[PDB]
Design a protein around this nucleic acid. Sequence first.
DNA 1: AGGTAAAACGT
DNA 2: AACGGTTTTACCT
Length: 202
Amino acid sequence: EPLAAGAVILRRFAFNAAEQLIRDINDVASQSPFRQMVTPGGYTMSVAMTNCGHLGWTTHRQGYLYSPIDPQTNKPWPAMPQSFHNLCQRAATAAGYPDFQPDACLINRYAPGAKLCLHQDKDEPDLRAPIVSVSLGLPAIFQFGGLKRNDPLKRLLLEHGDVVVWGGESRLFYHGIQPLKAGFHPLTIDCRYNLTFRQAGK
DNA sequence: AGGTAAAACGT
DNA sequence: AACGGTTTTACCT
Ligand SMILES: O=C(O)CCC(=O)C(=O)O
Ligand SMILES: [Mn+2]
C-alpha cells in the first residue's frame, strides 16, 4: 500500500549518500547556524533549524516567510550543496516527480524530545511542486494525515536514509513528527536530521 | 471577504 | 498518551 495519492516513502533511499549529506549539513551550519525559531505566538520551537539554497523558511513576528537572507547572520543562506540537490533530484524522479526543481532546503535538527506538531506546508505559491523529505540519524514517528486536521493519521517510523515525497492530491496534507526518543546513531551520535526540499519561489 | 496565525494544554 | 480544542479570535491585505 502506497502512502497517499501522489505520496510515497522510499525506504533507505538516501542511505548510501548519508555520510556526505551529513558533512554538508555541518558545512551549511558553519555559515548559517542551527537556531530554534520563535513562533508569532512567542514560543520557541523544539526543533533547531537552518536553511540552504536560494530561499529559507523562517518565523517572524508577523508569521512564516521564505527569505533569501538569514535574519540571524544578515547574509544569504549558504548555497544548496550539490550532494543535497543530486539526492533530491534522484528521489523526486523515483517518486514520479522528475521535473522538480527545488530552490529551498530546510534543515531540521531533532534533539531528544523535539517534535513538530501537525501542520501543512503551505507557504509556497506553486502548489504543483512536491515536498521531498530526507531522514538522517535517529528514528522518528512521522504522522501523515489528510486535508483536514482531524483526518485519520497514518503513523510511520522513519529511519536513517528514508525519503518521503508528497505532492499533487496529497500536497497540502497535514503531517508532523512525534517527540524524538533518545538513542544512539553512529553517524549523528544523538540526534535526527531532516532535509526538506521545496520550490518556494517561481 | 479571505488568509494566517497554532510548525504552538486538557482529557 | 492519542486526540482534539483553540482560531470557541485578532489582525492584516
Ligand atoms: O522532520 C520531518 O520529517 C518533517 C519536517 C517538516 O515537516 C518540515 O520541516 O516542514
Ligand atoms: Mn512540514
